[PDB]
Structure formats: C-alpha cells, structure tokens
From a paper:
There are at least three reported GEFs for Rab11 (3, 11–15); the Rab11 GEF distributed most broadly throughout the eukaryotic kingdom appears to be the multisubunit transport protein particle II (TRAPPII) complex. Yeast TRAPPII comprises 22 subunits encoded by 10 genes, and yeast have two Rab11 paralogs, named Ypt31 and Ypt32. Each of the 11-subunit monomers forms a triangle shape in which the TRAPP core subunits appear to be grasped by tongs composed of the TRAPPII-specific Trs120 and Trs130 subunits. We describe two different conformations of TRAPPII: an open state that allows Rab11 to access the active site chamber and a closed state in which the Trs120 lid encloses the chamber to enable Rab11 activation.
TRAPPII monomers bound to Rab11 adopted only the closed conformation. Viewed from the “side,” each monomer forms a chamber in which Rab11 is sandwiched between the core and Trs120. Superposition of the published structure of inactive, guanosine diphosphate (GDP)–bound Rab11/Ypt32 (37) onto the nucleotide-free activation intermediate indicates that the GTPase “switch I” region has undergone a marked opening concomitant with nucleotide release. As found for Rab1/Ypt1, Rab11/Ypt32 makes contact with the Bet3, Bet5, Trs31, and Trs23 subunits, and we observed density corresponding to the C terminus of one of the Bet3 subunits interacting with the opened nucleotide-binding site. Somewhat unexpectedly, we observed that the HVD of Rab11/Ypt32 binds to the same pocket on the Trs31 core subunit that binds to the HVD of Rab1/Ypt1 in TRAPPIII. The structure of the TRAPPII-Rab11/Ypt32 activation intermediate supports this proposal, as we now observe that Trs120 makes multiple direct contacts with Rab11/Ypt32 on a surface of the GTPase that is distal to its interaction with the core. We identified three different ordered loops of Trs120 that contact Rab11. One of these loops (“loop 1”) interacts with Rab11/Ypt32 by adopting a β strand that binds to the edge of the GTPase β sheet. The other loops (“loop 2” and “loop 3”) make primarily electrostatic interactions with Rab11/Ypt32. In the closed state, nucleotide-free Rab11 is tightly sandwiched in between the TRAPP core and the Trs120 lid, suggesting that conformational change is necessary to enable Rab11 to diffuse into or out of the TRAPPII active site.
Author numbering:
A (entry chain g): 2 to 157
B (entry chain e): 37 to 64, 87 to 265
C (entry chain l): 7 to 186, 197 to 209
D (entry chain h): 2 to 76, 98 to 147, 166 to 219
E (entry chain f): 7 to 192
Amino acid sequence: GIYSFWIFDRHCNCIFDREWTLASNSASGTINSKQNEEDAKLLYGMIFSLRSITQKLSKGSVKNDIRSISTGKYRVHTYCTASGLWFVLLSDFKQQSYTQVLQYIYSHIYVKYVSNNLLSPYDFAENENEMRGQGTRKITNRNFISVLESFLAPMV
Amino acid sequence: LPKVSQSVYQMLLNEMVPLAMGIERQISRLKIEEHHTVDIIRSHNLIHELYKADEEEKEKVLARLRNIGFQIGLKLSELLIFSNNPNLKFKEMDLLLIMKFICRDVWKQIFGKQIDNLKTNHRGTFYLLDYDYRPIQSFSLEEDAKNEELKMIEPFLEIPVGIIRGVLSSLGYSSEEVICLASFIDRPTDRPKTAFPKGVSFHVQVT
Amino acid sequence: GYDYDYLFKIVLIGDSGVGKSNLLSRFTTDEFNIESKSTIGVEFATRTIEVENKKIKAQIWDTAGQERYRAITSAYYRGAVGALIVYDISKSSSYENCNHWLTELRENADDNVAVGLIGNKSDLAHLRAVPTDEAKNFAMENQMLFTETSALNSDNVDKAFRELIVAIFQMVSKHQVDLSGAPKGPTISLTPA
Amino acid sequence: AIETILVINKSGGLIYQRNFTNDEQKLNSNEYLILASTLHGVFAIASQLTPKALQLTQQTNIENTIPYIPYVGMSLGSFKGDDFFKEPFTNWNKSGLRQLCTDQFTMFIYQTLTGLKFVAISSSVSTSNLAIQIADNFLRKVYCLYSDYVMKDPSYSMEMPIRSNLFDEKVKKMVENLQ
Amino acid sequence: SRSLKAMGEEIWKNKTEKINTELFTLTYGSIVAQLCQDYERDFNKVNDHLYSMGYNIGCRLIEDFLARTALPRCENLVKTSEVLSKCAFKIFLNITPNITNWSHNKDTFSLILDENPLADFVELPMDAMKSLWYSNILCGVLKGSLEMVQLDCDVWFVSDILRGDSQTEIKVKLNRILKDEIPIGE
Ligand SMILES: *C(=O)CCCCCCCCCCCCCCC
C-alpha cells in the first residue's frame, strides 16, 4: 500500500513524519522520530530540485506542478498547494495515482485539525532562526495522528 | 433567503477568546499598514496567555466574553420571535416552555444540531446537556497533555452561556435573577466517540 | 549553441566556510538556477574558452558535504577531469584538510586528474595562519599548481583556471587533422551484358 | 509524442540535445547542461532513499523483465532484420530514478549498465506502467542506434559531445515513426 | 478544467454547509459593538484591532479556500483579481464584487461591494460618521490570505456606503511578490 508519509511547509521544514513497516496495520510507526531527520531533508531536496526543473522547462500559461516520481523499486506521490505545503507519500506501484487520497487528506484532516485548531500553531517557524530548514516543531495533535492512522490503516 | 458559509461563521465565532484576551491586554510581530506600524499578536499565543496570566485577568476576560455572548443572544432573540413566533408569554408561564424554545430554535439556528436532552428539577435549576459541542470539535494539544486540555478550553465555553443569558433577557427575567455556569462534567455515555472526548453541560438557575 | 568541441568536468572542492561560493563569483555566466547547493549538493557554473583554435566548455561542480552527503558526494567525482582544491589562509584546519581532500580525489576521481590549489581571502593579512612556502612545498610533492586569490587581487584565479584547462587539454586531446576536381559529364554504361 | 531526447555521458554533462518540437526553443544550450547535471544528481539522491522495508527484503526479481513491443521502432547498420530485438530484456537500474510524471509532460530515463543515460521527454501524459515499457523499448532502440553510429566513429573522443550526421538524422526518423 | 465562475457556482451550490446571513450580521455587529464599548469609543484605532482580527482569521481561511478550490498559485494580478472576484468571495459570503479602476501598469485595482453582508443593516452614529469603517475585517482577511500565497499587498478602504459615500471600495495595491525560500547550509 504505502511506506511513509511526509508533510513540508512554505518554510522548507519537515512538519510530519510517519514511517510504516510490514503490512500489519499496527506497524513500527515512529512518528516525528529524530532517526528520520536525515532522510527527509534530502527528500525535500529531490522534490524541490525536480519541481524547479519542471517549472523551468514548462510551457503554456499554467506553471505546471509535478504529480508523481517513480524510481526502480518505489514511487513518490506528491501534491503541492498554493500555500506552500507539500504532501509527499512513498509507496509501491499497485495503482495509478494517489491524487484523490492526498487531496482528501489535505481537505479533511490537515485543514480540519490543524488550520481550524486554534490551540495549535500554524506556520511553525516562529520568530525567525528556523524559517529556512533549520528547526523542528512538528505537529503532535492527538486528533491529527489518530484520524490519519485510521484513514491510512486500510491502505498499507 | 440569503445564506453564508458555515465555515467562515464558525471561524469568526471561535475568534472571540483571542479577541477577549487581546483587547484586555491592549487596554492594560510589528507590521505596517501603509505608513504607521501596528502590533499583531498571533491568535494561538493568546489562548496560552489566557491560561497562564492571572486569576483577576482571567475573570475580566471571561466577563467580557460573557458580555459578547449576552449581546449576541439579546439581538438574536427578537428576530427569532419575529420569524418562528413561539407560544411563549412575556414574563413566565413556566420555565420549561422557555427552555424548550431555546433548545428547539436557538441552537438549531446557531449550531447545526439540536441540543440533546435536558434535566428538570421542576422548582429550581435546569441542566442543558450537549454532546460533542460543534465549535470545539477540532481542538487538541497533545497525546499526553490531556488535563491541560480541559482547563485551557474553559474560556471558549462562555459564549453559549452568554447566549443563553441574553435569550433569557428580553423574555422576562433579567440578568440579576439568572445565574448560568458551563462545565465539562458530562460523559460520552453511549454515543459514538467523536474527536473531542468530553461533553458540555449548562447549569442555568433562575428565580 | 552546441559549438563547443569538448566538455570537461571540474570539481571545486574545499572545506565548509572557506569561501568557495565567493571564489567562483568571477569565472561564471551569472544566470540560470541559483542556489540549489543544499538541495542536491552542488551548484553549477560554466566557462567557454578557445585553446589551439578549438572551443572548450568547462563545467564546474562546487560540491560540499555538510551532514547528509556521504555516498553522493563520492559519486559526484565519477568522471571529473579536473579539480580546484580550495583553502583559506586564515585557519590551519582548512589547509590541513587538503591532504584528505586530495586523497578522496585521487582515490575516486578520474585517473591522472589535473588538480590545483587555491588560497582564498589572501587580502586579510591580519589573521594569516599558513605561509606560502609551506603551501608551495606541499604542492611540489603532489604534482599541483598553486596560487593565492583575493577580491582586491582578482584576475589571478581566472588565469589559473584557464591555465588548468590548458593543462587538461594537453592530456585528453587526441591528435586530429583538418579533413576538409571531381569528374563531371555524361557517363556511358560499361557493365557486361 | 516524444518531443525531446537528451543523453548524459557517464558522469553528468550533456552530449546530445536534439529536440523535435515544432517551435519552442525556450531553453538555451547552457541551461540544458544544468538540467542534465541536476538529473544525474537527483538520480544519485534517489538511489539512497529506499524505504527500510525493501532494503533487507526485495523478493521482486520477476518484474524487472521488460516485455517487448512488436514494432515500436519504425514502420539498419550492424544489426539486421525487421527490428533491433524480438526477445524480452531485463532492467538494469532497479534502484534509480525511472520516470517523472507531470500534467504537461512525462520524462523517462533509461540507464545503461556501463553508465550511459538516455532521457526522453514526451508531451503525452496508458496506465502509467505500460508507458514505462514503451519508453524502455524506444530508449534501447536509441541506445542501439547510438552504439552503431557514435561508437564506430574514429573522430569522436569518449564521453564528449556527439557531433555526428548519421546518428541524429536516424534518431529523428525513429522518433518520427513513433507518435 | 473550467472557468473560475463555473467553479464558483458549482462549489457554492452543493459543496458547502450554510448559515443564515442575519446571524452573521448579528455576530459581527456584537463584536464591533463590544470593541466600541470597551475601547472608550476612540474610533481612530479600533480599526487597527479589526484589521488584526482579519489578518488572523484569513491566515487560517486561506487553507480552507485552497483545500476546497485547489487552484494553482497566482502569479499576476489580472488572474488574482479574477480569482478573488468570482470564486473566493462566492464560496464564503456568496457575493461577486466588481473590478474597476485598473491603475497604470496593472499595479493596483479596487473591489466594489455591491452588497456587503457584514454591514447589511447598520446606522452609524454622528460620532462615527467619518471615523469608523466597520468593514475593516474584510480587507484584513484579504491581505491575511494573500500573504500566505506568497505575495505582499497593502489593502485599505477608500469609501463606504455606511459613511455616506456613493459606493464601498477596497484598493488592494501590491508592494512586492516575495520569492520562495530555499534551504541554506554552511
Ligand atoms: C491566488 O491563489 C489568490 C487567491 C485569492 C485570495 C484568497 C481570498 C480568500 C478570502 C476572501 C474573503 C472571505 C470573506 C471573509 C469575511 C469574514
């Protein structure tokens, strides 16, 4: 189904980490673990670099955005919003694209339990000194993690 | 009849506790409009500040927010009476009819769901019990910090108290013979569990 | 504009904070994708020069490994026919790391690679910590060209870079020759019946 | 409709950038070198981002084989027959960047065992898995053509720009057939 | 996919919960009235606090707007004007402000509110006849949203029907389209 799920923001800082394992739903879900801080910055570097390549050689008057990126083994499903908030997802092939799934996540989990969640912050880079990739203030909202795990439990 | 999106309305309605703290601090992030600088303070910081500022500061803020709710209820009551036209009289036939009107109409118009069952001691106080309480359905802190949750949502529970107090006003009893208090003592008895764990109870007493 | 005959790969490697980014501020076409250093690990600059009446394109790869680039930084020397080791004469650590950098280049880069030594921020004589004599002596043992560069002393790195490309071109250039009264009239068949 | 084909020699750096679009010419020669080098670097990054689940257990050496299309090529040099190859062949870059999907174009990458890289950009956006097979077959077609008319060339240094006359026109014909 | 307008009525018709306009008027009027009451009726910079409110709520509301519509990022103001004229207001307040007064070099423009649901039926006092705006929250939300789309623009009120002018206008002049951020490591 899937392997890992990542959320970045406008400020080039990874906001959410969820890594999966063998197809048991109650997998080794190390959420926001420091051990994957290394293999998130280079993923963001991949996505930013290929996005720049896509925009540079683009044509028309739409400024296209990358949809998916497949390596030999896995593939990357990416959804970038105008507000600067990237939803990336590692997964085996098995099916065409996850655009509907990522859109549903953005429109019914993040928007509902983070943006409309005035207790929690938004634009997690606060008062400079971590606006440019150097910081960690990852979300730990109870509802976000619970509902997100419930939603991705069938697909794995 | 004209309509407005419920999302923006709920966002505005939640945006009273940050108002209530910010205005009080103004009486007691630098940014430019066009030529003069104005200080803007993030909304989520003000809830933290209201939690951990002072007892008298908290009381002032809660009274202010209750006044806001009172104004909302007072203005809304006249339009509801004009439109739906309940079978109430001015001062008091029985309080049960008044509270039934509130439950059936005011919460239908403000929130998207009719308020749930209500107790009745038949002489004194009335308890209005609401399950899952729409305007805080997406309010959380942390997996472990659960006790902080209840204590730091408490200011948000004043606007419906103000609404009930205002609706009681302009309908006979004024705001001297009526005392109302909200609390989280409610349980999710047997309904399906929602995001927020705790219910809401409105203990309203009149004489 | 695909007129350049040869494409040489050069790597601009040095210690972090030495000032490589300012070092390659001159020999550039200051356009195109800026930054991208932290994304993949390299930023790209190009130069065009004619040597022996033959256009040459030189591509400069200013790699750096901060915390994430262990294997990729090694792979980025896959076919580099040139290297431009950089150190600052302010702190002896940058000069000390030159042997380690040269070890990586000669272990992984292209065989018989032409590699040089650049001394940046030489205008600041206040905090000098590495003498020219020691740097030159270290260059002698390892078959390298050596120079010192500064903002006030500019136009020296350009000449050193051109000279390095000339040294490369005298090594990876196969000799060639300029390959540049036909019958006219109606013919008659002569094939046998 | 493969609108652009470019190839990266062995270590980054561009050596052939013939494109077959009607008239765009938006990118100069200089930027395409940056594009190719960035592609090589992103390939290197993608190699070292396998999930932990697949690193220790692959069990997938049956899907690497590419089924062959009958006449994807056209309608020769050292080769002979109606096509360059009839049999099915195997994938080499099982741990590298393989395509890039975009709503306006799709990039395919085919890496030789030696290190030669062949990149094809197509305007067409197929179930997003058959198109991999089509692209791999076409790119091995182009690689065979390159091995014919670029490797058997006395006046061509290794891993340098491909300034030849037969190779480019024959790949132009080949891409013209495929549409 | 489709025109901005068609997207607007399509989303408004059957992809949104709704609430009565009069309740919205009552709530916002109560907010402004309490602000007037507790701030000693010093109308000079009650407007600043309403602007701060608008900024704060719009910073969250842009997330909902983009999650629903899922538009691309807006580059030039000719397209941004189309967007926030024919879909952004339509989703939330169910109105279609008109666009006129295109400044030179397409730098600025104005939103004309043919109907203002925030101020449906209000009568300001003589004290506030030329001091208060009463719809400052709207321009606050406009810029609070536009900041999150990576473009800075000063927005203010030129006129209002409540004060007695012919029409309500909102000039939305730009300052600079700030660039996206890139990581740095030294
Ligand atoms: C490019 O994507 C530009 C997007 C348009 C800006 C978003 C505007 C959303 C806010 C509109 C105002 C809603 C009413 C608020 C009053 C309470």
